[PDB]
RNA sequence: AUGAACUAGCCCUGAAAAUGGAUGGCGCUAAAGCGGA
RNA sequence: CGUCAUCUAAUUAGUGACGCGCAUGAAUGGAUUAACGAGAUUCCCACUGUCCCUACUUGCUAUCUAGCGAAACCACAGCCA
RNA sequence: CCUUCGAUGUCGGCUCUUCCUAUCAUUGGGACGCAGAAGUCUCAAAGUGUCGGAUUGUUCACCCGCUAAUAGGGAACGUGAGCUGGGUUUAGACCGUCGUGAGACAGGUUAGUUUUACCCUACUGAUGAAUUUUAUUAUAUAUAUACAUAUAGUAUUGUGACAGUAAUCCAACUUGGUACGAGAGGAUUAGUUGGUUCAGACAAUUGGUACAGCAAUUGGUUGACAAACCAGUGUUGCGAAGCUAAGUCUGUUGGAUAAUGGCUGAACGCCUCUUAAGCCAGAAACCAUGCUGAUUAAACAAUACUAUCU
């Protein structure tokens, strides 16, 4: 007979195999659609997560109850040191999917790029990438000519520089960044000028832009149905315990179905989230990187006492409205939208009035360390 | 009159007994329903400081009792966030008896009243002494 | 940046910190931390606590 | 050089139930279907 | 789920009345009754994680390891429409 | 009365998933005894929803409410080694009617033990080798070649067959006191600002949490001070970091169609959306895009370095 009362299903079946992810790094599944009237440009970047803070902003929404008022919002800080471009790779279309022609490498690579190919570098002779970079340029140009002639997709290989962060790890992270833009010849002439240089973050993104974020959620281990799926907790009188599901299924499909929620592993899942707005792009050469026109105290972004569990941020960075999956130090992949947004929020430009830099250990009360000494006077 | 009312935390579920805050003759209100509440299986309807409710009077003058009446919440004791960046809470829970159209049955509110409520109902803002 | 006093231990409160409270009469109080609000709702007096600004003023210590 | 009224072969409407399913399956229309030689 | 009143916002429940009572009734004891009861029922105040709606936390198990080490049950055996 | 009496646990509720359409609301349409508004009959359609309570053990029923609507059903009358045990249905006891009596009552009432998973599968997560009767959507210098090519080890970056999939509904204001109407009344559509249910995360702020920490204190015991300890956490106040909701953030657009309305146009010198041939527009439905997995393909590619030895 039918269930007495109706209620929507607990889980979502579109994220179903709730297992641990294959890797820490978040991988892009699809790149933005290639428009060939635009000039060639990069489409992605990668950084690390530092912490959160809050800001003060003036609203500009005619019709709202908050039309002309100062509000407070939370934000997330991503440390965004420049990457290095080290190679090129070209794909062509087949009925079996995309297909690699070849890979061309630059003339010199760094030791933190080579560490990613070893399980233990400290005991090795370190002979990776010591013969192949010594090829004549003629072979490379013939290969690039073939790529220009037969390929339809270019991507550029880039890597991060973990020595400029407070991380304990020394291996760099490697990823492929697709290059949209004009014709294949223009794409090739674009990439080659960058083959051993730095990508700063403001070459890829702009202020007030809308971005997508890819990363891996925080891990929690084995969890029960009550926490993993959110099911109704069961009465106090129950004999074998109350944190479970009462009925696993009817008699007679004489099996358990795959839609029934069970115990299992929770967290450490891979996710892609849309529409996170950029509020400010900081620069490591700037003394007042957290001061506004209304607050001329000369400040940096790092709060009094360091970002808790991360360290001090002293490269250039991003400020994102909202929140992002992952722990402190977790690598975050950034991507442009699949097609550009034209709504009112994505076009509106933001002017900030206050960034907060008080301590996040305990309950902080000052914005700088000089205020603290000025308030108490001389101590013992 | 616009009905925008950015969201406010609900803590006053069905079955609560609150003060009456005006000079109509009643002394308390017993909440029995909340207007515009949807469907969710085991969930109790609950209200915040600008909502209209259905209620009865448990002690007060005999012509107001044994009836279903309308009311509007003016003060609440549960903390709620203001978009400027702080949190607020009152002493007690209070409301006034009104028409289905929001017209007062009395003619004077006793204590302070919240600004979010006074923006949605103009007669109440007219009849209040302090708007906080 | 505009700040306000703490009404119990008169510090300065920067935006995004506070906690206000309305008495039975329409007097507004504004505390910043949990500790100060807890002390004020237990009916304790700031003049009776050694670490507050009020005590140091009544003992010629500022 | 049109207008009707009847009659009977194939086809069609009438034709709604619960795990996913059954001309035995694939499939078949110059039949690999129906009535004959 | 007798009719009337009351209790609630809403009462097959509780109490007070009515009585052609399928089939009440006088030591088969009738009608009452202060005090008493780990006896059966209804409402009110106080109180609270019973509940909205769950979260956090301690001991002892469970877990992995060195030793020690049983039983029920068993035609043959274990994917589906 | 076919199967089960060397036993298939016998009412209702709570919990949880899936299926049907004889469609209540939400989407797009046809008709009216259709001015507008409000409704009634009917077509494609199961994508998304279908509640809080008083009385009763209840299924059923009835009333008070909100809502957009509070549709009907199945899965051994779904679901007891999931629970509960109020009713029914052992043994105690009271009442009425019946019986000479022991006793009876599908008539009331009160009190009355709910046992076992470590096996096999199923399902949820977690490690992991082996794979030449095998594979190939090319490789070489416009030319040749399947009469071909292919070792292993460690490691990075990738392709993506196939399977799963996600958003939903409402209000106010403007259009507009306008269209329509004698009056009374009074749309659709589009725009703006908000909200409900659901899903995926997160902790700058607010709250909860305490066997990090600091302080206070009752009884007792070290001769006193100081320092401590015991009372299975002696008892109180605050309480960082971490976890956490009641707190904060985010939640697309294309292809091809169904119902229906049409175009050109014979049959049938007229006509006809085709009940011939040939075409157009078109829905919360379908297929993709997007998202999760991919020892689901005993699947594969490029690259770097190396193997008494190609
Ligand atoms: Mg029990
Ligand atoms: Mg903190
Ligand atoms: Mg200093
Ligand atoms: Mg319930
Ligand atoms: Mg005729
Ligand atoms: Mg046959
Ligand atoms: Mg045959
Ligand atoms: Mg009752
Ligand atoms: Mg008799
Ligand atoms: Mg006698
Ligand atoms: Mg007798
Ligand atoms: Mg042990
Ligand atoms: Mg044996
Ligand atoms: Mg048997
Ligand atoms: Mg048995
Ligand atoms: Mg059985
Ligand atoms: Mg209707
Ligand atoms: Mg009908
Ligand atoms: Mg059954
Ligand atoms: Mg049946
Ligand atoms: Mg049982
Ligand atoms: Mg049962
Ligand atoms: Mg069972
Ligand atoms: Mg019983
Ligand atoms: Mg008995
Ligand atoms: Mg706190
Ligand atoms: Mg805390």
Angle between helices A184-192 and A137-150 (to 10 degrees): 150
Q: How far is C52 from chain A (nearest CA, A)?
A: 13
Can you tell me the distance from the alpha carbon of A189 to that of A182, in angstroms, rounded to the nearest whole number? 11
- Residue A100, Cβ density class (10 Å: 0-12 exposed, 13-18 middle, ≥19 buried): exposed
Query: Long-range contacts: B105-108, Cβ < 8 Å, 24+?
Result: B105/B22, B105/B24, B106/B22, B106/B23, B106/B24, B106/B25, B107/B23, B108/B22, B108/B23
Q: Which letter does DSSP use for residue A123 in this model?
A: G
Residues by chain with Cβ below 5 Å of ion ligand 4: B 42
Can you tell me the distance from the alpha carbon of A204 to that of C30, in angstroms, rounded to the nearest whole number? 45
Q: Are A223 and A341 in contact (CB under 8 A)?
A: no
Helix (H, G, I), strand (E, B) or coil at A328: coil
CA distances from A135 to A70, A188, A194 (A): 62, 20, 19
State both tokens at A360: 């996040």
Find residue B122's DSSP bridge partners.
none
Question: Given C16, C32, C33, which is nearest A356 (Cβ)?
Answer: C16
Q: Are A186 and A26 in contact (CB under 8 A)?
A: no
State both tokens at A124: 């090795």
A129 touches chain C (CB under 8 A): no
Centroid of ligand 15 to alpha carbon of B82 (angstroms) = 64
Helix (H, G, I), strand (E, B) or coil at A216: strand
Determine if residue B42 is labeled as part of a ligand binding site. Answer: yes
CA A38 to C1' F4, in angstroms, rounded, equals 79
CA distances from A263 to A22, A220, A260, B3, C29 (A): 21, 13, 10, 44, 48
Q: Are A205 and A199 in contact (CB under 8 A)?
A: no
Q: Are A305 and A265 in contact (CB under 8 A)?
A: no
Q: Which letter does DSSP use for residue A370 in this model?
A: H
Q: Do B4 and A5 touch (CB under 8 A)?
A: no
A71 touches chain B (CB under 8 A): yes
Specify whether the backbone of A32 is left (phi greater than 0), alpha (psi in -120 to 50) or beta.
Answer: beta
Question: Given B6, B85, B119, which is nearest A72 (Cβ)?
Answer: B85
CA angle A344, A346, A352 (to 5 degrees): 100
Helices and strands counted in chain A (H then E) = 6, 15
Task: Name every residue whose Cβ is closer than 8 Å to that of residue C25 and which is 6 or more positions away in sequence.
Answer: B111, B112
Instruction: Mutation target for A interface from B40, B85, B117: give the one with most A CBs within 10 A.
Output: B85
DSSP letters for A130-161: SSGGGS-HHHHHHHHHHHHHH-SEEEEEEE--
Can you tell me the distance from the alpha carbon of A365 to that of C32, in angstroms, rounded to the nearest whole number? 9
Q: Are B19 and B74 in contact (CB under 8 A)?
A: no
Q: Are A337 and A89 in contact (CB under 8 A)?
A: no
Q: Are A284 and A315 in contact (CB under 8 A)?
A: yes
Q: Do A54 and C34 touch (CB under 8 A)?
A: no
CA A17 to C1' F98, in angstroms, rounded, equals 72
- Residue A149, Cβ density class (10 Å: 0-12 exposed, 13-18 middle, ≥19 buried): exposed
Can you tell me the distance from the alpha carbon of B17 to that of B31, in angstroms, rounded to the nearest whole number? 7
The 10 Å CB-count burial string (b at 16+, else e) for C4-37 is bebbbbebbbbbbbbbbbbeeeeeebbbbbeebb
Q: What are phi and psi of A345, to 5 degrees?
A: -65, -40
Q: Do A354 and C15 touch (CB under 8 A)?
A: yes
Find residue B19's DSSP bridge partners.
B28, B94
Helix (H, G, I), strand (E, B) or coil at A275: strand
Pairing of strands A174-180, A198-199: unpaired
* Alpha helices (H) along chain A: 111-114, 137-150, 184-192, 225-228, 344-347, 369-376
Q: Are C55 and C49 in contact (CB under 8 A)?
A: yes
Determine if residue A360 is labeled as part of a ligand binding site. Answer: yes
Q: Which letter does DSSP use for residue A178 in this model?
A: E
CA A328 to the chain's CA centroid: 12
Question: Given A54, A65, A232, which is nearest B6 (Cβ)?
Answer: A65
Q: Are C3 and C12 in contact (CB under 8 A)?
A: yes
Chains touching C by CB (3 or more pairs below 8 Å): A, B
CA C45 to C1' F286, in angstroms, rounded, equals 73
Q: Are A326 and A49 in contact (CB under 8 A)?
A: yes
Can you tell me the distance from the alpha carbon of A230 to that of A221, in angstroms, rounded to the nearest whole number? 16
Q: Are A303 and A359 in contact (CB under 8 A)?
A: yes
Q: Are A231 and A215 in contact (CB under 8 A)?
A: no
Q: Which residue has the tokens 């305990």?
A: A362
C1 touches chain B (CB under 8 A): no
State in Å, rounded, how far the first CA of chain A is from the last one: 80
DSSP letters for A61-106: -TTSTTTT-EEEEEEEEEE---EEEEEEEEEE--TT--EEEEEEE-
State both tokens at B122: 């103009």
**What is Dmax (Cα atoms) for chain C?**
35
Helix (H, G, I), strand (E, B) or coil at A378: coil
* 3-class DSSP string for chain C: CCCECCCCCCCCECCCCCEEEECCCCCEEEECCHHHHHHHCCCCCHHHCCCCHHHHHHCCCC
CA A281 to C1' F105, in angstroms, rounded, equals 92
Can you tell me the distance from the alpha carbon of C5 to that of A371, in angstroms, rounded to the nearest whole number? 16
Cβ of residue B42 near strand E, that is under 7 Å?
Answer: yes
Q: Which letter does DSSP use for residue A51 in this model?
A: E
CA A248 to the chain's CA centroid: 39
Pairing of strands A331-336, C28-31: unpaired
Question: Residues, chain B, total?
Answer: 132
Half-sphere exposure of B81 (CA within 13 A, CB side): 10
* Alpha helices (H) along A205-363: 225-228, 344-347
Q: What are phi and psi of A113, to 5 degrees?
A: -80, -35
CA angle B5, B11, B16 (to 5 degrees): 120
Can you tell me the distance from the alpha carbon of A299 to that of A314, in angstroms, rounded to the nearest whole number? 12
Half-sphere exposure of A335 (CA within 13 A, CB side): 25
Q: Are A198 and A83 in contact (CB under 8 A)?
A: yes
Which of A344, A350, A331 is closest to A44 using CA atoms? A331
Helix (H, G, I), strand (E, B) or coil at A260: coil
CA A91 to the chain's CA centroid: 25
CA angle B82, B85, B91 (to 5 degrees): 50
- CB count in 10 Å sphere of residue A248: 11
Q: Are A90 and A156 in contact (CB under 8 A)?
A: no
Q: Do B42 and A66 touch (CB under 8 A)?
A: no
CA C37 to C1' D1, in angstroms, rounded, equals 110
Instruction: Mutation target for B interface from C22, C23, C29: give the one with most B CBs within 10 A.
Output: C22
Question: Given B41, B83, B84, which is nearest A5 (Cβ)?
Answer: B41
CA C34 to the chain's CA centroid: 11
Q: Which residue has the tokens 């101590």?
A: A379
Q: Which residue has the tokens 């969201």?
A: B7
C14 touches chain A (CB under 8 A): yes
Cα torsion A44, A49, A55, A58 to 10°: value is 20
- Strand D contacts (Cβ < 7 A) comprise A 252-254
Which of A354, B77, A128, A205 is closest to C16 using CA atoms? A354
Chain F positions with an atom below 7 A of a protein C-beta are 13-19, 48-53, 64-70, 72-79, 82-85, 115, 122-127, 137-138, 154-161, 164-166, 171-173, 192-208, 237-244, 246-252, 289-294, 296, 301-306
Q: Are A304 and A296 in contact (CB under 8 A)?
A: no
Q: Are C43 and C19 in contact (CB under 8 A)?
A: no
Kindly provide the resolution of this structure in angstroms, with one decimal: 2.5
Q: What are phi and psi of A13, to 5 degrees?
A: -85, -5
Can you tell me the distance from the alpha carbon of A320 to that of A45, in angstroms, rounded to the nearest whole number? 14
C12 touches chain B (CB under 8 A): no
The 10 Å CB-count burial string (b at 16+, else e) for A1-30 is eeeeeeeeeebeeeeeebeeeeeebbebee
The 10 Å CB-count burial string (b at 16+, else e) for A39-70 is ebebbbbbbbbbbebbbbbeeeeeeeeeeeeb
State both tokens at C6: 């703490």
Can you tell me the distance from the alpha carbon of B22 to that of B43, in angstroms, rounded to the nearest whole number? 31
- Residue A341, Cβ density class (10 Å: 0-12 exposed, 13-18 middle, ≥19 buried): middle
Q: Do A72 and B84 touch (CB under 8 A)?
A: yes
């Amino acid at each position: 007979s039918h269930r007495k009362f109706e209620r929507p299903r607990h889980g979502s079946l579109g994220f179903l195999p709730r297992k641990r992810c294959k890797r820490l790094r978040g991988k892009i599944r699809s790149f933005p659609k290639d428009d060939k009237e635009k000039p060639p440009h990069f489409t992605a970047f990668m950084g690390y997560k530092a912490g959160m803070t809050h800001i003060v902003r003036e609203v500009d929404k005619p019709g709202s109850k908050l039309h002309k008022k100062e509000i407070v919002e939370a934000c997330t800080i991503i440390e965004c040191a420049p990457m290095v471009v080290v190679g090129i790779v070209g794909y062509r279309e087949t009925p079996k999917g995309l297909r690699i022609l070849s890979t061309v490498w630059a003339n010199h690579v760094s030791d933190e790029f080579r560490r990613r190919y070893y399980k233990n570098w400290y005991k090795s002779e370190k002979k990776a990438f010591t013969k192949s970079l010594n090829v004549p340029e003629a072979t490379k140009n013939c290969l690039l000519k073939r790529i220009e002639k037969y390929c339809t997709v270019l991507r550029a290989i880039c890597h991060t520089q973990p020595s400029k962060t407070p991380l304990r790890m020394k291996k760099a992270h490697i990823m492929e960044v697709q290059i949209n833009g004009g014709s294949m010849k223009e794409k090739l002439e674009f990439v080659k000028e960058m083959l051993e240089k730095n990508l700063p973050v403001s070459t890829v993104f702009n202020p007030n832009e809308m971005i997508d974020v890819i990363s891996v959620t925080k891990g929690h281990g084995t969890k029960g149905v009550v926490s993993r799926y959110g099911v109704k907790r069961l009465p106090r009188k129950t004999h074998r315990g109350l944190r479970k599901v009462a009925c696993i299924g009817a008699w007679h499909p004489a099996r358990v179905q795959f839609q029934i929620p069970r115990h299992g592993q929770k967290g450490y899942f891979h996710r892609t989230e849309r529409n996170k707005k950029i509020y400010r792009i900081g620069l490591k050469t700037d003394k007042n990187s957290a001061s506004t026109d209304a607050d001329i105290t000369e400040k940096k972004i790092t709060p009094m006492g360091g970002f808790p569990h991360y360290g001090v941020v002293n490269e250039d960075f991003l400020l994102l409205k909202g929140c992002v999956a992952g722990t402190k130090k977790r690598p975050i992949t950034l991507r442009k939208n699949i097609v550009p947004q034209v709504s009112r929020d994505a076009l509106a430009q933001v002017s900030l009035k206050f960034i907060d830099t008080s301590s996040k250990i305990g309950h902080g009360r000052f914005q700088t360390s000089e205020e603290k000494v000025k308030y108490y006077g001389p101590l013992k | 009159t616009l009905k925008n009312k950015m969201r406010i935390t609900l803590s006053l579920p069905v079955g609560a007994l609150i003060n009456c805050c005006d000079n109509s003759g009643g002394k308390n209100l017993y909440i029995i329903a909340v207007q515009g509440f949807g469907s969710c299986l085991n969930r109790l309807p609950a209200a915040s400081l600008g909502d209209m409710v259905l209620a009865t009077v448990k002690k007060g003058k005999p012509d107001l009792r044994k009836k279903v009446l309308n009311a509007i919440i003016c003060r609440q004791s549960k903390a709620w966030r203001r978009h400027e960046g702080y949190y607020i809470y009152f002493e007690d829970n209070a409301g006034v008896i009104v028409n289905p159209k929001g017209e007062m049955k009395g003619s004077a509110i006793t204590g302070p009243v919240a600004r979010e409520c006074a923006e949605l109902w103009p007669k109440l803002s007219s009849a209040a002494s302090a708007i906080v | 940046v505009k700040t306000e006093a703490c009404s119990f231990s008169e510090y300065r409160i920067y935006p995004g910190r506070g906690q206000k409270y309305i008495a039975r009469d329409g007097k507004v109080y504004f505390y910043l931390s949990s500790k100060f609000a807890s002390l004020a709702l237990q009916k304790k007096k700031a003049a009776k606590l050694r670490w507050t600004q009020t005590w140091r003023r009544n003992n010629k210590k500022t």
